[PDB]
Design a protein. Structure first.
Length: 176
Protein backbone atom coordinates (compact mmCIF):
# COMPACT_ATOMS: atom_id res chain seq x y z
CA UNK A 1 0.00 0.00 0.00
CA UNK A 2 2.92 2.32 0.76
CA UNK A 3 4.46 3.81 -2.38
CA UNK A 4 8.15 4.64 -2.65
CA UNK A 5 9.03 8.27 -3.32
CA UNK A 6 12.61 8.05 -4.64
CA UNK A 7 13.42 11.76 -4.41
CA UNK A 8 11.97 14.55 -2.29
CA UNK A 9 11.45 18.17 -3.24
CA UNK A 10 12.48 21.17 -1.18
CA UNK A 11 11.28 21.18 2.42
CA UNK A 12 8.40 23.49 3.33
CA UNK A 13 6.69 24.43 6.57
CA UNK A 14 7.10 23.95 10.30
CA UNK A 15 4.61 21.38 11.62
CA UNK A 16 5.82 19.30 14.55
CA UNK A 17 4.29 15.91 13.72
CA UNK A 18 5.51 15.75 10.11
CA UNK A 19 8.17 17.21 7.86
CA UNK A 20 6.67 18.36 4.57
CA UNK A 21 8.30 18.34 1.13
CA UNK A 22 7.17 19.61 -2.26
CA UNK A 23 6.23 16.66 -4.45
CA UNK A 24 8.52 16.20 -7.44
CA UNK A 25 5.72 14.13 -9.04
CA UNK A 26 2.96 16.77 -8.79
CA UNK A 27 3.44 20.44 -7.79
CA UNK A 28 -0.10 20.47 -6.36
CA UNK A 29 0.94 17.86 -3.77
CA UNK A 30 3.46 17.54 -0.97
CA UNK A 31 5.09 14.58 0.78
CA UNK A 32 4.39 14.57 4.53
CA UNK A 33 6.60 12.26 6.57
CA UNK A 34 6.33 11.52 10.28
CA UNK A 35 9.06 12.88 12.51
CA UNK A 36 10.78 10.64 15.07
CA UNK A 37 8.74 9.90 18.16
CA UNK A 38 5.51 11.48 16.89
CA UNK A 39 3.37 8.32 16.58
CA UNK A 40 3.85 7.27 20.21
CA UNK A 41 3.88 3.49 20.51
CA UNK A 42 1.69 2.92 17.43
CA UNK A 43 3.77 2.04 14.33
CA UNK A 44 4.03 4.89 11.86
CA UNK A 45 2.54 2.82 9.03
CA UNK A 46 -0.70 2.36 10.99
CA UNK A 47 -0.88 6.04 11.96
CA UNK A 48 -0.49 7.08 8.32
CA UNK A 49 -3.10 4.56 7.19
CA UNK A 50 -5.56 5.80 9.82
CA UNK A 51 -5.03 9.43 8.77
CA UNK A 52 -5.75 8.69 5.10
CA UNK A 53 -8.95 6.82 5.97
CA UNK A 54 -10.20 9.49 8.37
CA UNK A 55 -9.38 12.28 5.92
CA UNK A 56 -11.41 10.49 3.24
CA UNK A 57 -14.30 9.77 5.60
CA UNK A 58 -14.52 13.44 6.61
CA UNK A 59 -14.26 14.48 2.95
CA UNK A 60 -17.17 12.17 2.12
CA UNK A 61 -19.18 13.56 5.04
CA UNK A 62 -18.84 17.10 3.65
CA UNK A 63 -16.11 18.49 5.89
CA UNK A 64 -13.41 20.73 4.39
CA UNK A 65 -10.14 18.80 4.52
CA UNK A 66 -6.55 18.87 3.37
CA UNK A 67 -7.06 16.00 0.94
CA UNK A 68 -4.85 12.91 1.27
CA UNK A 69 -4.02 10.88 -1.83
CA UNK A 70 -1.55 8.08 -1.10
CA UNK A 71 0.45 6.30 1.56
CA UNK A 72 4.14 6.93 0.88
CA UNK A 73 7.57 6.02 2.20
CA UNK A 74 11.07 7.34 1.57
CA UNK A 75 14.06 5.39 2.94
CA UNK A 76 12.91 4.71 6.51
CA UNK A 77 10.43 7.60 6.60
CA UNK A 78 6.70 6.93 6.37
CA UNK A 79 3.78 9.23 5.68
CA UNK A 80 1.06 10.53 3.37
CA UNK A 81 0.96 12.43 0.08
CA UNK A 82 -1.37 15.40 0.48
CA UNK A 83 -2.60 18.53 -1.24
CA UNK A 84 -0.14 21.40 -0.82
CA UNK A 85 -1.59 24.55 0.77
CA UNK A 86 0.57 27.54 -0.15
CA UNK A 87 1.28 29.96 2.71
CA UNK A 88 -0.88 27.90 5.06
CA UNK A 89 -1.24 29.07 8.65
CA UNK A 90 -1.25 26.31 11.26
CA UNK A 91 -4.13 26.71 13.70
CA UNK A 92 -1.94 25.63 16.62
CA UNK A 93 0.35 28.58 15.92
CA UNK A 94 -2.73 30.82 15.93
CA UNK A 95 -4.32 29.60 19.17
CA UNK A 96 -0.95 29.43 20.95
CA UNK A 97 -0.30 33.03 19.78
CA UNK A 98 2.92 32.15 17.97
CA UNK A 99 1.44 33.63 14.78
CA UNK A 100 -1.56 35.80 13.98
CA UNK A 101 -4.30 36.01 11.39
CA UNK A 102 -3.76 38.84 8.88
CA UNK A 103 -5.88 41.96 9.17
CA UNK A 104 -7.60 41.44 5.79
CA UNK A 105 -11.38 41.55 6.15
CA UNK A 106 -12.30 38.92 3.55
CA UNK A 107 -9.71 36.59 5.09
CA UNK A 108 -11.22 36.76 8.57
CA UNK A 109 -14.75 36.43 7.18
CA UNK A 110 -13.79 33.15 5.51
CA UNK A 111 -12.33 31.88 8.78
CA UNK A 112 -15.59 32.78 10.53
CA UNK A 113 -17.92 31.21 7.96
CA UNK A 114 -15.89 28.01 7.59
CA UNK A 115 -15.57 27.60 11.36
CA UNK A 116 -19.35 27.98 11.65
CA UNK A 117 -19.92 25.47 8.84
CA UNK A 118 -17.59 22.94 10.46
CA UNK A 119 -19.40 23.25 13.79
CA UNK A 120 -22.77 22.76 12.09
CA UNK A 121 -21.68 19.43 10.60
CA UNK A 122 -20.25 18.28 13.94
CA UNK A 123 -23.63 19.03 15.52
CA UNK A 124 -25.76 17.59 12.71
CA UNK A 125 -23.78 14.34 12.46
CA UNK A 126 -22.79 14.08 16.15
CA UNK A 127 -19.17 13.07 15.63
CA UNK A 128 -15.91 13.68 17.47
CA UNK A 129 -12.65 14.08 15.55
CA UNK A 130 -9.54 12.87 17.36
CA UNK A 131 -6.60 15.29 17.24
CA UNK A 132 -8.72 17.86 15.42
CA UNK A 133 -6.55 20.54 13.86
CA UNK A 134 -6.57 22.86 10.88
CA UNK A 135 -4.68 24.70 8.19
CA UNK A 136 -5.88 28.11 7.00
CA UNK A 137 -5.09 28.72 3.33
CA UNK A 138 -4.10 32.11 1.96
CA UNK A 139 -7.73 33.21 1.45
CA UNK A 140 -8.79 32.33 5.00
CA UNK A 141 -10.51 29.01 4.31
CA UNK A 142 -10.25 26.46 7.13
CA UNK A 143 -9.25 22.88 6.32
CA UNK A 144 -9.11 19.92 8.69
CA UNK A 145 -5.57 18.55 8.69
CA UNK A 146 -4.11 15.24 9.87
CA UNK A 147 -7.30 13.92 11.50
CA UNK A 148 -6.64 10.82 13.60
CA UNK A 149 -10.14 9.30 13.78
CA UNK A 150 -13.82 10.17 13.45
CA UNK A 151 -16.44 8.42 15.58
CA UNK A 152 -20.09 9.05 16.40
CA UNK A 153 -20.06 10.70 19.82
CA UNK A 154 -20.46 14.02 21.61
CA UNK A 155 -19.08 16.74 19.29
CA UNK A 156 -18.44 19.17 22.14
CA UNK A 157 -14.67 18.69 22.40
CA UNK A 158 -14.43 19.16 18.63
CA UNK A 159 -16.78 22.16 18.58
CA UNK A 160 -14.55 23.74 21.23
CA UNK A 161 -11.45 23.25 19.09
CA UNK A 162 -13.12 25.12 16.22
CA UNK A 163 -14.40 27.88 18.50
CA UNK A 164 -10.83 28.29 19.74
CA UNK A 165 -9.76 29.35 16.24
CA UNK A 166 -13.01 31.17 15.41
CA UNK A 167 -12.49 33.53 18.36
CA UNK A 168 -9.43 35.09 16.72
CA UNK A 169 -11.50 35.83 13.61
CA UNK A 170 -14.34 37.28 15.69
CA UNK A 171 -11.92 39.53 17.58
CA UNK A 172 -10.52 40.89 14.31
CA UNK A 173 -13.92 41.43 12.68
CA UNK A 174 -15.22 43.31 15.74
CA UNK A 175 -12.34 45.78 15.20
CA UNK A 176 -13.34 48.41 12.64
Amino acid sequence: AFHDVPSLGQKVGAGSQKDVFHSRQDPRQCICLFRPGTTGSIPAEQYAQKELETTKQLKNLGFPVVDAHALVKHQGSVGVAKDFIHNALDSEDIVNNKKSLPDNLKFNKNVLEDCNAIIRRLKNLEVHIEDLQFLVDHNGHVLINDPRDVVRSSPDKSISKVNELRSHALNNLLDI
